[PDB]
Paper text:
Glucose-6-phosphate dehydrogenase ([name]) catalyzes the first and rate-limiting reaction in the PPP; the oxidation of glucose-6-phosphate (G6P) to 6-phosphogluconolactone with concomitant reduction of nicotinamide adenine dinucleotide phosphate (NADP+) to NADPH. [name] is a major source of cellular NADPH and has a primary role in controlling the metabolic flux through the PPP. [name] is catalytically active as a homodimer or homotetramer. Each monomer has one G6P binding site (i.e., the catalytic site) and can bind two NADP+ molecules; one is close to the G6P binding site, and the other is the structural NADP+ binding site.
Numbering used by the authors:
A (entry chain N), B (entry chain N): 28 to 511
Amino acid sequence: QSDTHIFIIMGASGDLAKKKIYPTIWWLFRDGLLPENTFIVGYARSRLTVADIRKQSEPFFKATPEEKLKLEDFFARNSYVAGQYDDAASYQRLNSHMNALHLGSQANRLFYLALPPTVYEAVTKNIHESCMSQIGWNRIIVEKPFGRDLQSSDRLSNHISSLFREDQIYRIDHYLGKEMVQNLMVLRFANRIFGPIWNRDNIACVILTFKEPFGTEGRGGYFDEFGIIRDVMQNHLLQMLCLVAMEKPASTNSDDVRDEKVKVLKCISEVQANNVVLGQYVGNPDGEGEATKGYLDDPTVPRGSTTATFAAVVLYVENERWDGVPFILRCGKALNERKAEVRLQFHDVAGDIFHQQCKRNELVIRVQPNEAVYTKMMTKKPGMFFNPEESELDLTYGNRYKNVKLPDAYERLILDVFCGSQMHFVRSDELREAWRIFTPLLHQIELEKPKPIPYIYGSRGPTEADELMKRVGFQYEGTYKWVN
Amino acid sequence: QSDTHIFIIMGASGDLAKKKIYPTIWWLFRDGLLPENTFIVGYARSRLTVADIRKQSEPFFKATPEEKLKLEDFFARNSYVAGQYDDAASYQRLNSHMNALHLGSQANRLFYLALPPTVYEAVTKNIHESCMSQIGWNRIIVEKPFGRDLQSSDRLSNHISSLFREDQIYRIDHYLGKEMVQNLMVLRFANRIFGPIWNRDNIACVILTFKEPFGTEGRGGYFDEFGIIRDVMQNHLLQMLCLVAMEKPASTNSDDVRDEKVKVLKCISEVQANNVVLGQYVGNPDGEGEATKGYLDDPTVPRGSTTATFAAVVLYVENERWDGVPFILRCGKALNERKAEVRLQFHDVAGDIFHQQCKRNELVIRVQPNEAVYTKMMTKKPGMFFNPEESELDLTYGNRYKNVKLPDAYERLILDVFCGSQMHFVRSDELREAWRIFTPLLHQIELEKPKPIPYIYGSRGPTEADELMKRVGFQYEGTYKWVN
Ligand SMILES: NC(=O)c1ccc[n+]([C@@H]2O[C@H](COP(=O)([O-])OP(=O)(O)OC[C@H]3O[C@@H](n4cnc5c(N)ncnc54)[C@H](OP(=O)(O)O)[C@@H]3O)[C@@H](O)[C@H]2O)c1
Ligand SMILES: NC(=O)c1ccc[n+]([C@@H]2O[C@H](COP(=O)([O-])OP(=O)(O)OC[C@H]3O[C@@H](n4cnc5c(N)ncnc54)[C@H](OP(=O)(O)O)[C@@H]3O)[C@@H](O)[C@H]2O)c1
């Protein structure tokens, strides 16, 4: 558009703004993806100047000697306004400043809330009362945490919704912005090969995985407040579940897609402790650097802490497509690898004519690292053999899509907020559903404080997780050898 | 087994025996696949000796300096008997010779008929009356041609069946012996991912392909007698159709599999000339060697010959699984490439939510060259794109199964004849069905002698073939770019 656009970084002083948001909008700017008439305004308490932000931020850019773009053009379109987060005059200074930009009164306004959540109500209120364009649209971008249980999430959401329409709320889950997570819809609904099999007649279980090989790395005090399931499971993994489980939406329109995701969530009952295994990492006596230290060997972590760093959990979607099909959600810190992944384990072929030599098919979408889709499969053993054996059909983006830059999540999503696309952004009802499922578990843990199961830095986590997966009907072999 | 085995090469003097069969049984011998107590007897008119066969044949072996195996051991187990193909005494000499081998009277007998078909009745009769073990099994291996129309195929089959049980008849189609052709059953019936889609609700058409880039190469007189459809279409391609179309058999047992193949064939009506395009190659004025010469520029080919070197033909299987689904059979000589292939083109996804940007899925099993299975597919365009585009999931045996020797068809099949496995061998009823489908077409051509459509050496054949495929509902794009 020819419309002017104002991207306000609320909290421009802090680390997220310095190392993520300023770089991200830079890169968007750099690549000709923003509107031409775009201005960046930072707002934080410190008495900063555009020079002080350039010095903070441009070591985090792709600083290249082609920097006319960077040359003030990007920074010339930057300004800064100092201000307190619940001082009304401050927001008049801000609004007034925005107004004095080129067509500032007309411009579309996009407020990035790069702030801690203890200030989200104040900032939000103040924006509403004093800083809203009266002509252009007004969009707010909010980061996790969105509450820490139902009731607290409800507080925040009822506040925001009183001030802003759903039209205006862009809650980011950086997961919706990943290449492979966006691909799920295309994989499923642009292809007949998948789809007729995408149901309980064919699938024995869905595994949704998120693994990190690093522990907590000095920041354990921060993590200890919420733990792994609040961290990763109620947001990222449950999102993947939704995209997997979704009925086909009426259209790609943002709210036809999101009302399929909530629809699924509504068929999932509160998770019971029968279906949970919790883990906390201890260090490896035979390890290297950080890997020697357990969760409790952070001096930032309170002594006797019970917080879990690993959780496997089994959910069920009580509907026609999925009745009975366990959805295993599996995540953790200080594990054997970095990986996030969707796997379908299909049922045994009916009426076996090979002689218990078949192995269940699997469909694997590996979100990270090394973006790949493959199906684990049966072929006839190459050569003089009459036997089936395990093989696969592969799409690996590394090799096929060799010269294709994949954007970072924040590049994609922030672009979506300019283009007005809420598809990849957690809706209010979605967020309620998410909290409903996990809240009574969460409180059970807070109350009764169960000892999580010990596992070694770099292991696959507690063995009890595997027994849970096996008990709901996952089958692990030993037999699938991959090469290349 | 410890049982003695006698492999008789009827026609040991000729080129097939010299360059295929002697080498093939050698290689089997060499690799420890035959029984220990195996003897090879050659039978032909010429007054030859084992020395004369060694000199003929061992340039066609993998002559390696590890040749104890070759050292007479292989040749020490060779003998030769001269004889006429309908002289009774000759078959007494032969039978008597077999008898004087170690446990020759007990031994299992396996007669390879490496002879021209003008002698198949004589040889067969003579074997039956004078050369059958009375203790061990007796198996005959017969090569195409099996007749040239129904009535002629019936003659031969009624002859053979009067003498031999079906138990005893191993009609070779070297196609059933290829790696990928054997794989079809495993691909289909060892995997849930395929299979629920393996039907008319999901498939728009099946393409069965067999292409050669060489013309006729001086041997056109031989080819001119039968033409392309007798050559390739009624055997190899119709076999692939059967393996594709087959209901799931009750067991891998040889005759539960073959009675699925005939079952399909029985739902296919005689092909009409509406559904046929015929081609004959002319040479390329802008070509290289042989490729400059048209079919008629062989002096071996009779002037004004009408024989077709290319044929596309559309068949239908009138049953529950396949009603309406065209099965396009496409083959030819002097084409753009060597290839044999199975392709399923799936229907459009129902209720499109992308915007006519989807392309039909395809499942490709490439039998030769470069044994591969892949599915052509839709993924989201990598990067900042919301669009689907064409991609694929690949199994390429070249890369995955890098160090795996694939045997030649004749190695596999002849081994099957020792192990007593008829699965990969054309049954009598099958062969009747095959002739029924094509015979009235064949005779129509013999009678009315239509001018085949000209196409250039190295082209994809006549463009009218593409119009036929498009008219029955194949859709070709232009858009699928593969790399690697
Ligand atoms: N080009 C490519 O991208 C490509 C294609 C095909 C295969 N590969 C590689 O080949 C390897 C094997 O493939 P795969 O992971 O799909 O097959 P796999 O080894 O069969 O993994 C199956 C799953 O079993 C789980 N599991 C449950 N109970 C288990 C137990 N008791 N013991 C062990 N594992 C148990 C594993 O958890 P974990 O997640 O904790 O292991 C894993 O998710 C991987 O490293 C993969 O990256 C790469
Ligand atoms: N690793 C691997 O093995 C691997 C994997 C994927 C792709 N590839 C390669 O990628 C290339 C493209 O793949 P593909 O052949 O499956 O896709 P394609 O180019 O879409 O071929 C589709 C089919 O369209 C037929 N056709 C019908 N009407 C046509 C018309 N008017 N113009 C052109 N073609 C028409 C072609 O006949 P023809 O058979 O005469 O061409 C062919 O069978 C191939 O060379 C393939 O070997 C290799």
